[PDB]
């Protein structure tokens, strides 16, 4: 509306990948979606029903409802000075289960056991991750040294493969 249709500017976004057209593999229809799961919205161009607006393509949201053929997804949308919680329904052909939280569950268990193993011995520790820190000092065994020097200029070589 107001100068732009629903699918305006979707020539590339909503087109199928090269040599990946035709029948949709059935693993898409065997996925299980639960409330609270995170899903990435990826519009399939072949399915014209229950397809989200182009804005939600490439966005990750949280599942808040499950129907026969579609899942309700909560997606953040920035409008001026506010973030809106947009609730949309999308057919499962356009959603992929996201691996954004794949490390959380396995990390909690490791932290829980590490704290438990430390509680029994009365040693207070921290399970927090840390970013890459500075490396310690070390010795490197001597080896043959290859000398690098600037190369004399040659005009004939100022072209891919030369002139």
Positions 43 through 72 that interact with RNA (CB under 7 A): 45-53, 55, 57-62, 67-70
Interface with RNA, residue 112, by CB under 7 A: yes
C-beta of 131 vs 136, nearer to RNA:
131
Choose the one of other proteins, RNA, none that binds residue 121, judging by a C-beta under 5 to 8 angstroms depending on kind: none
C-beta of 116 vs 139, nearer to RNA:
116
Interface with RNA, residue 31, by CB under 7 A: no
C-beta of 35 vs 46, nearer to other proteins:
35
C-beta of 75 vs 140, nearer to RNA:
75
Interface with RNA, residue 135, by CB under 7 A: no
CB 25, min distance to RNA, A: 3
CB 101, min distance to other proteins, A: 17
Whether residue 51 contacts residue 43, with contact meaning beta carbons closer than 8 Å, is answered with yes
DSSP, res 67: -
Residue 85: which of 64, 57, 102 has the closest Cα? 64
User: According to CB under 7 A, which one of 106, 121, 128, 153 is a site residue for RNA?
Assistant: 128
Q: List C-alpha distances in Å: 27 to 23, 30, 32, 92.
A: 12, 5, 10, 11
Buried b (16+ CB within 10 A) or exposed e, 80-100: eeeeeebebebbbbbbeeeee
C-beta of 66 vs 118, nearer to other proteins:
66
For 17-64, the DSSP string reads PTT--SSPPGGGTT----TT-EEEE---TT--SSPPPGGGTT-EEEEE
**DSSP H or E run through 73:** strand 70-79
| Interface with other proteins (CB under 8 A) | 64-67, 72, 78, 80-85, 87
């Amino acid at each position: 509306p107001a100068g732009h249709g629903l699918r305006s500017r979707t020539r590339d976004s909503f087109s199928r990948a090269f040599r990946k057209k035709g029948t949709i593999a059935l693993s898409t229809y065997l996925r299980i979606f639960k409330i609270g799961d995170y899903v990435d919205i990826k519009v399939n161009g072949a399915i014209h029903k229950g397809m989200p607006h182009k804005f939600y393509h490439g966005r990750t949201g949280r599942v808040w409802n499950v129907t026969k053929r579609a899942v309700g997804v909560e997606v953040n949308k920035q409008v001026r000075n506010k973030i809106l919680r947009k609730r949309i329904h999308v057919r499962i052909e356009h959603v992929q289960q996201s691996r954004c939280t794949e490390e959380v569950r396995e990390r909690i268990k490791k932290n829980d056991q590490l704290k438990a193993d430390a509680k029994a011995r009365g040693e207070v520790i921290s399970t927090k991750r840390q970013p890459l820190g500075p490396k310690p000092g070390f010795m490197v065994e001597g080896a043959t040294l290859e000398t690098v020097t600037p190369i004399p200029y040659d005009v004939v070589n100022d072209l891919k493969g030369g002139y």
